[PDB]
C-alpha cells in the first residue's frame, strides 16, 4: 500500500493479542505504545520527544502485526500521547518515503533552506506540524503550544513561511522553539508530494 500524508498515517495492528490504532511514524527512531497488557520481562528504560522525556517498559521480541505485516521486535511501553509505529519496525514491513525514494534505515534527513539560512530537518510523518529549533525568521509570529511525546513546549507561529526541502519549494507555517530535532510535519511534507509506501 502507498499512502498520502493529507492525514495522518494509521494503521491497524495487532499486539498482545489486542487490536489497536498506531501512526507510522517517520520521526520516531522507536515504538511506543500507550500503556497495555504484555505478558513476559521488560527492562525501565527513559525516551525523549518534544516536551521532554517519558519513563517506559522496554519489551523485546514482540510480535506485531502493522497493517497485516507481521514484524518482531523491541517495543516501548508507557505514557505516550498516541500509539507509535518507529523505525525498528518501520524498516521490516519494508515501509519507503516517496517524493527520490527513502528507506528508513538511518534517520529521513533532508537538507532545507529557511529564511537565507541551510539547515538539516527529519521528515517526520508522525508530526502534523513543521517545528524548527530556535533561528532568526524576519516578521510576525504567534504564540503557541504544541505537544510531543514528553509533554508540551512553546513555539512561535510563522505563516506563509517558505522554505526549499530537499530542493522542493513549499510554503507554509513553520513553528520555532524548543524542539530537539527540527522536523518537517504532514504540513509541508503533501506539499512536496511526499507519500509513505510498504
Ligand atoms: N517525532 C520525533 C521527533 C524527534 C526525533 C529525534 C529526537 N532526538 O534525536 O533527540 C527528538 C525528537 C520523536 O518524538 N521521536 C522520538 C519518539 C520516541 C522514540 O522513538 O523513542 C524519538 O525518541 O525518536
Ligand atoms: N512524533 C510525533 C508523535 C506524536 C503524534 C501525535 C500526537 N497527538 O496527536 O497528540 C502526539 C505525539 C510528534 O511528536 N508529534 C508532534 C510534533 C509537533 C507538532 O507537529 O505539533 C505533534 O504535535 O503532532
Same mark, same amino acid.
Given at each position: 500500500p502507498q499512502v498520502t500524508l493529507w492525514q495522518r498515517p494509521l494503521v491497524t495492528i495487532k499486539i498482545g493479542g489486542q487490536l489497536k490504532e498506531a501512526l507510522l511514524d517517520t520521526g520516531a527512531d522507536d515504538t511506543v505504545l500507550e500503556e497495555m497488557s504484555? %505478558? &513476559?520481562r521488560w527492562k525501565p @528504560?527513559? /525516551?525523549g520527544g518534544i516536551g521532554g522525556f517519558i519513563k517506559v517498559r522496554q519489551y523485546d521480541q514482540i510480535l506485531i502485526e502493522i497493517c497485516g505485516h507481521k514484524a518482531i521486535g523491541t517495543v516501548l511501553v508507557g505514557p505516550t %500521547?498516541?500509539?507509535? /509505529? &518507529?523505525?525498528?519496525?518501520?524498516?521490516? /514491513?519494508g515501509m519507503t518515503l516517496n517524493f527520490p525514494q527513502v528507506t528508513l534505515w538511518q534517520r529521513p534527513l533532508v537538507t532545507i533552506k529557511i529564511g537565507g539560512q541551510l539547515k538539516e530537518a527529519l521528515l517526520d510523518t508522525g508530526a502534523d506540524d513543521t517545528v524548527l529549533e530556535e533561528m532568526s525568521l524576519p516578521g510576525r509570529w504567534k504564540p503557541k503550544m504544541? =505537544? &510531543?511525546? =514528553? =509533554?508540551? /513546549? @512553546?513555539? $512561535?507561529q510563522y505563516?506563509?513561511?517558505?522554505?526549499?526541502i530537499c530542493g522542493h519549494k513549499a510554503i507554509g507555517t513553520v513553528l520555532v522553539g524548543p524542539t %530537539?530535532?527540527?522536523?518537517?510535519? $504532514?504540513?509541508?511534507?503533501t506539499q512536496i508530494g511526499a507519500t509513505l509506501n510498504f
Amino acid at each position: 500500500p502507498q499512502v498520502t500524508l493529507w492525514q495522518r498515517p494509521l494503521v491497524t495492528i495487532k499486539i498482545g493479542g489486542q487490536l489497536k490504532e498506531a501512526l507510522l511514524d517517520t520521526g520516531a527512531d522507536d515504538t511506543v505504545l500507550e500503556e497495555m497488557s504484555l %505478558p &513476559g520481562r521488560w527492562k525501565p @528504560k527513559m /525516551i525523549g520527544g518534544i516536551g521532554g522525556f517519558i519513563k517506559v517498559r522496554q519489551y523485546d521480541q514482540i510480535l506485531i502485526e502493522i497493517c497485516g505485516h507481521k514484524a518482531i521486535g523491541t517495543v516501548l511501553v508507557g505514557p505516550t %500521547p498516541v500509539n507509535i /509505529i &518507529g523505525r525498528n519496525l518501520l524498516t521490516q /514491513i519494508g515501509m519507503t518515503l516517496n517524493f527520490p525514494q527513502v528507506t528508513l534505515w538511518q534517520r529521513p534527513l533532508v537538507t532545507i533552506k529557511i529564511g537565507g539560512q541551510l539547515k538539516e530537518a527529519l521528515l517526520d510523518t508522525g508530526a502534523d506540524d513543521t517545528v524548527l529549533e530556535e533561528m532568526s525568521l524576519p516578521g510576525r509570529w504567534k504564540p503557541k503550544m504544541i =505537544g &510531543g511525546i =514528553g =509533554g508540551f /513546549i @512553546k513555539v $512561535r507561529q510563522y505563516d506563509q513561511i517558505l522554505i526549499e526541502i530537499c530542493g522542493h519549494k513549499a510554503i507554509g507555517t513553520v513553528l520555532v522553539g524548543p524542539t %530537539p530535532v527540527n522536523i518537517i510535519g $504532514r504540513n509541508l511534507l503533501t506539499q512536496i508530494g511526499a507519500t509513505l509506501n510498504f
